[PDB]
Design a protein around this ligand. Structure first.
Ligand SMILES: Nc1ncnc2c1ncn2[C@@H]1O[C@H](COP(=O)(O)O)[C@@H](OP(=O)(O)O)[C@H]1O
Ligand SMILES: Nc1ncnc2c1ncn2[C@@H]1O[C@H](COP(=O)(O)O)[C@@H](OP(=O)(O)O)[C@H]1O
Lengths: 281, 282
């Protein structure tokens, strides 16, 4: 089953309510922190790798010797909370927390956060194959059931719609950058520029190339340090980097499921900018 | 700087005085527990890997799927404390705590502990290259300084000499097994045999082969699940499995330092059996 906290599901191991409460009400956010925000399976690890690579100006020695979860801790997880509570600035970390569970300290800080959004249909699929043979989480009986759970928000970290809605209001803030998995896949070089512009970094052509090369799907898949997740998978049964493309949902959604989803989506996303939904294709 | 608790130095992150205090007067040791005790850098992870493989009957699936610090948690660390309190018996874990800070509930229990000692010279070198870059701990100005710090016990987990003296009194208790890094190196097969006898475990020939193979330095150095620790390092070059031999100290101690160290060792260790002093030799 799931570990519930304020109505949101978390894995049953690696997380503690006690910590979640502290994460939200006590964890100190510093203006020099760079935070990756995402709804699970939106490309968190991909973005973390890129940020690490931007730090190393392209060199891959560091990302290949130190695991990714150490280079960019998962703040609400036990290991991440413990680590970050002491790590020296500037800190780089990620989180999947919807706005009402995020460190309240963040709102009076100047910390920069990059919110990465992905087409919910692709997120759904990504989570389905990933959470399948995973342990310490409530597993659905079939694709049909998982689909249902996702549409209703009864999955890890709750509703994608709520997660998206709670955070969008921060969008116009100076310290908030919105990116889509889709634009990152379509124009990586251009998207990395936006990020450099956001974090105040500059790169030489050779450096950008190394980054593009070393953050590629295949390159990351072959890196033991980056294709490394601390979540407990049932090794007796069974892939962090699956396909790494966009639009794989068409290969799994029946026409029926697709029409239902478009209906659900059309509803929930009524109050948000249309340009917002366009950047998810 | 270090986190000082009861006169002993600990890392800045991952440990809380509140927890260290609870470790001592609250943590409950179970009779079914198997505990690894070592002064840091004496071969803790090597022994843990061996104990894990012994449990897995030589199979490498589990140890290659779950990180070592999860298979054998560090009891005095924040993570390890909380984890163990919720783990079902039989529990397997480690500790570097000198005897005066160890859970008192242990001394009236039947839990079996394996104390692994290593030549202090090799422990010093091993530590110097491992802590050298490490964060959350006081960094020595140089090799000369680290050497000094180690000799005076002003390093992580205090004096190696005090650590040894505090635990040796357990040497003859039945639920206590003393091993030396050097004997594990000299004849791993034999040492594992001793451990089996101590824990009351039998193994098939093929299982022993796999335990020896998978717990060997070369094989262990390849498993990212074991060739790592939850100690953030200011990356520079500081790997858990550095060389994995005995006597590497001769490659770093200056002749002067060696003389100085032999003098110090001889005085400090005078009150203990010569047998112990010999087991630390290569
Ligand atoms: N370098 C890369 N390029 C493209 N997609 C990548 C990638 N690294 C990871 N991904 C994808 O990002 C998703 C994981 O997201 P998260 O990091 O938030 O858990 C997976 O999607 P798929 O399952 O569709 O393949 C994974 O393959
Ligand atoms: N399978 C193995 N065989 C031999 N030595 C090993 C080993 N695994 C780890 N070690 C050694 O044990 C020491 C680390 O001890 P600990 O686990 O207590 O921190 C290191 O010593 P060196 O630095 O001399 O190589 C390391 O290489």
């Amino acid at each position: 089953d799931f570990l519930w906290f304020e109505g949101i599901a978390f894995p049953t191991m690696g997380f503690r309510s006690e910590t979640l409460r502290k994460v939200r009400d006590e964890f100190v956010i510093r203006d020099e922190d760079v935070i990756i925000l995402t709804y699970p399976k939106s490309g968190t690890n991909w973005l973390a790798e890129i940020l690490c690579l931007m730090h190393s100006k392209g060199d891959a020695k560091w990302i290949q010797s130190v695991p990714i979860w150490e280079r960019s801790p998962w703040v609400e997880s036990e290991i991440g909370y413990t680590a970050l509570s002491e790590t020296e600035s500037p800190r780089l970390f990620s989180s999947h927390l919807p706005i009402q569970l995020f460190p309240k300290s963040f709102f009076s800080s100047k910390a920069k956060v990059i919110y990465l959004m992905r087409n919910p249909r692709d997120v759904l699929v990504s989570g389905y194959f990933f959470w399948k043979n995973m342990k310490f989480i409530k597993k659905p009986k079939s694709w049909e059931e998982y689909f249902e759970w996702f549409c209703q928000g009864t999955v890890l970290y709750g509703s994608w719609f709520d997660h998206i809605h709670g955070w969008m209001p921060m969008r116009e803030e100076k310290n908030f950058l919105l990116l889509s998995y889709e634009e990152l896949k379509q124009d990586t070089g251009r998207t990395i520029e936006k990020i450099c512009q956001f974090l105040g970094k500059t790169l030489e052509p050779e450096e950008l190339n190394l980054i593009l090369k070393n953050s590629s799907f295949q390159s990351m898949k072959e890196n033991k340090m980056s294709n490394y997740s601390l979540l407990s998978v049932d090794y007796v049964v069974d892939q962090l980097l699956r396909k790494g493309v966009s639009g794989d949902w068409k290969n799994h959604f029946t026409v029926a499921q697709a029409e239902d989803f478009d209906k659900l989506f059309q509803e929930k996303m009524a109050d948000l900018p249309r340009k917002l939904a366009a950047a998810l294709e």
